[PDB]
């Protein structure tokens, strides 16, 4: 058998806000977090906008001295993690510290740090490389620093599965608790790839929307005018907890994590298969994992990245998995407002999926002015839709054809 | 309910050889793979030597056209993966492809590639960034490219837990099989951090041996004259397989994976606690996981990095876990010969642990001329030691206080 896993805490930095409730308020209002990127010369770049975290004060979390040691992506993961744990009311003790672990991930890691240390290296030589360069830049330091700050002695690791990281981190954390390896896990991802390398790298692959004139309209999933994804920064963390452990201490439970799917497309390095065969297997594996019929799904938070091939693959996949239920469920892309947080996309979108359950409302896909050929599902165009939601899926599909699906269910 | 997991295939690039047999011959002969680095000008650096992979021909594996797009760490991970799958004799079919996955990890990933594109960005501009920068550098693309080349549609992911990456990758892949999420996994790690940022970054932290005038004597675990670890490159991959699946197809089985342990130190970003309390918790979790008496442990493949604090912490941990049996078992560090392959360390060392079981021999700790205060166990100084090994244990410890232990035993 297998233990049940609930969500007792959530934390977040997004382009919509510095915590969950401010972000969610943005989501439900259909507000864009997308704007031209400030403090950074993007003159020579084909993209000049994205979703930045606005007004982030790391000294709410760390001393200036400790924060100087850590890439922005680590600072963002720590913010969300500290918010989630505090949100949970959990008390770490000598009696439970060994049963509390962390799996916070990143798709791309410490590009901003790598870039600033490259500056010093090329200009002045290696003796100007920071001593904290390595531990301050590597992806497992959100899990590392979090475990040290809070005395967490349970499983300590980090996933890096590109744009699937947040979904894989939360799902595998859920398994840890299910199979009795931990009672609590902090899980999710964080990302800050708005450097020359992030913007330039994705720009060189022409993966990015170049709609510089209207940044808030750039991210337009399933719209016939979409021209690639919008690069966004931030973090999501969830406190996952064994149900009996949660009930014993009188935890507030947001929702239950009932299902987790993984699959490989084995198709292409960056492009999904047109029929979304991969996303289809992943979702079926997730629903089998939950013991649920496709007919029981009410709400899907799409990957919905606003790439030509990605959006269409996901329509094909849902139609394949859900047959005559495909029009009944609501499916929206919150990336229409947040843009694409890469490795943190699945973390924030899991939180939005959980809040859709709490509040019985499907978030909008904004900018969906002219749905493309075959995009005739209920994609919650323009405005939040109040509706019945017992079961919510969150999908992530990343480079290497790596797929992730999470199934959350109302708890009561 | 929990299924058993065996090793049916192994693959490797190391500073001692371009495969497992060649590498293993060097280990038992006590040969060093450590030499001044030839691929760049290190005269401005305080460390000028490492374990390079010598004479790697990527066109034994991949088209020059595909190889040109990929960081060496990905080329190294693919090379070891292809070797391991060939060594397993497994045939991928429509019938089984959905039950075969991959978890190949890296500590740092595509740091050379990121440096090169960073140079292009700063010297020329964003328009000279490779269109393959992202899919050619990010850590999950060993798992991705492997899945694409062989058509593996099982769980597809990557860990990044610094110097623990290979041990965790293998351990968690076994759990995937144990719990029925897959019947087969290719798992391990790859690293190529021997660029300016890598040697400069570890150099800035004063973590590396500076013995530039005698590189083969640099890596000297538990020796009183040790002065840091030696940075080495390469890859380890294992085919892990549910026992009955292996039996059904008549697979040759090298050994059984009976035990996996994880723990966080929750101590320090980069330093281990002097008493090895985190390593001790991890090894105890792994032995309890294997259903063993600690006295069954015959051979330990130590982390054994040749750092002052790391080496002694591990003595403390082994004494605390094994009591008087700490004086009966044999413990060696193959890092004495290979150097520290970082995220690949746990992968090659898992392979050396399985070959200690096959060949009934403890690999030497070379350069152990003057064991330090309290380093009074059988550390197999200087020369391989033929002996009874029924149970072998492989330890890794990383930045963020992240610990991993694998337990393997003979299968008959
Ligand atoms: C330049 C050189 O080889 N010096 C000797 C040494 C011993 N430990 N670290 C350095």
TrEMBL record, chains A, B:
Keywords: Acyltransferase, Fatty acid biosynthesis, Fatty acid metabolism, Lipid biosynthesis, Lipid metabolism, Transferase. The gene is fabF. Belongs to the thiolase-like superfamily. Beta-ketoacyl-ACP synthases family. GO terms for molecular function: 3-oxoacyl-[acyl-carrier-protein] synthase activity. The keyword Lipid biosynthesis applies. Its EC number is 2.3.1.179. It catalyses: a fatty acyl-[ACP] + malonyl-[ACP] + H(+) = a 3-oxoacyl-[ACP] + holo-[ACP] + CO2; (9Z)-hexadecenoyl-[ACP] + malonyl-[ACP] + H(+) = 3-oxo-(11Z)-octadecenoyl-[ACP] + holo-[ACP] + CO2. Pathway: Lipid metabolism; fatty acid biosynthesis. The active site is at 163 (for beta-ketoacyl synthase activity). GO terms for biological process: fatty acid biosynthetic process. SUPFAM superfamilies: Thiolase-like. InterPro entries: 3-oxoacyl-ACP_synth-2, Beta-ketoacyl_synthase, Ketoacyl_synth_AS, Ketoacyl_synth_C, Ketoacyl_synth_N, PKS_Beta-ketoAc_synthase_dom, Thiolase-like. Residues 2-410 form the Ketosynthase family 3 (KS3) domain. Involved in the type II fatty acid elongation cycle. Catalyzes the elongation of a wide range of acyl-ACP by the addition of two carbons from malonyl-ACP to an acyl acceptor. Can efficiently catalyze the conversion of palmitoleoyl-ACP (cis-hexadec-9-enoyl-ACP) to cis-vaccenoyl-ACP (cis-octadec-11-enoyl-ACP), an essential step in the thermal regulation of fatty acid composition. It comes from the Bacteria. GO terms for cellular component: cytosol. This is 3-oxoacyl-[acyl-carrier-protein] synthase 2. The lineage of its organism: Bacteria, Pseudomonadati, Pseudomonadota, Gammaproteobacteria, Pseudomonadales.
